[PDB]
Structure 1
Amino acid sequence: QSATTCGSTNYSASQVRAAANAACQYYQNDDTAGSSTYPHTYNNYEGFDFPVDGPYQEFPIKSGGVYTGGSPGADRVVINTNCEYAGAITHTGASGNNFVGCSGTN
């Protein structure tokens, strides 16, 4: 990854990488962060043009640190089953329960 803006929230390349790595670690361990269902399957029903092939996993990304449970916020990182980074999406600026891309994900 690169630095990305989700809504108006800015994340550095390192922050994206950290979230992605955590996502991978949980997925490969067949575990979830706390009582949450993250990471879990991500269905691209909206048609994001990800640079990598699926299937996908989504996991929250937040400014304050790697997600460990609790409220996930509006932002997510998307990785494939090989832990290849697919992109960053957010509920910010989307209607209903949909997502829009963070900068760089279209």
Structure 2
Amino acid sequence: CDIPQSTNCGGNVYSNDDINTAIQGALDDVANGDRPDNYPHQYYXEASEDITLCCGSGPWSEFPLVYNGPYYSSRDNYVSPGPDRVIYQTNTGEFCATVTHTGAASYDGFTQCS
């Protein structure tokens, strides 16, 4: 769907530019064989009960959502991905959702941003 003007991930508010930057960043990264901290990761889901995608069929990818993006981490300079992520349609770059570990029931769990 169209990138929202802003999104609230457990207190961290990101703009449409932060979101777009994450997706564009991830696509460029993949195109050049640079996968910072091994992201993007595949998003395996439609079975998900608390995450609603606003995009079509998979495959779906997930990449860290951060300020002054896009997220980047290097061989000798580790940078934490933080708790927030963007999910996009792998083959098209279509925005699907913003999710976060913040406010989830377990450390590895996710909830949708508002």
Q: Distance in 1 between matches of 2:69 and 2:94?
A: 21
Number of positions where the alignment pairs a residue of Structure 1 with one of Structure 2: 101
**Per-residue Cα deviation, 1:48-89 (whole angstroms, up to 9, x for no partner):** 221112211000011243200121000001111221111100
Q: Distance in 2 between matches of 1:79 and 1:59?
A: 8
> Cα gap change, 1:28/1:80 in structure 2, threshold over 3 Å: closer, same or farther?
farther
Question: Post-superposition, which runs of at least 4 consecutive aligned residues in structure 1 deviate over 4 A?
Answer: none
Of 47, 67, 77, 1:63 maps to 67
Matched, 1:25 2:28: yes
Residue matched to 1:99: 110
5+ unaligned residues in a row in structure 1: which ranges? none
Residue matched to 2:42: 41
Q: Taking every aligned residue pair, what percent have the same amino acid on both sides?
A: 36
Q: Distance in 1 between matches of 2:94 and 2:30?
A: 12
Paired residue secondary structure (1:94): coil
Q: How many angstroms does 1:31 deviate by? A: 3.0
5+ unaligned residues in a row in structure 2: which ranges? 74-78
* Higher Cα radius of gyration: 2
Q: Distance in 2 between matches of 1:40 and 1:12?
A: 22
Computed over aligned residues only, the root mean square deviation of the Cα atoms, in angstroms, reads: 1.5
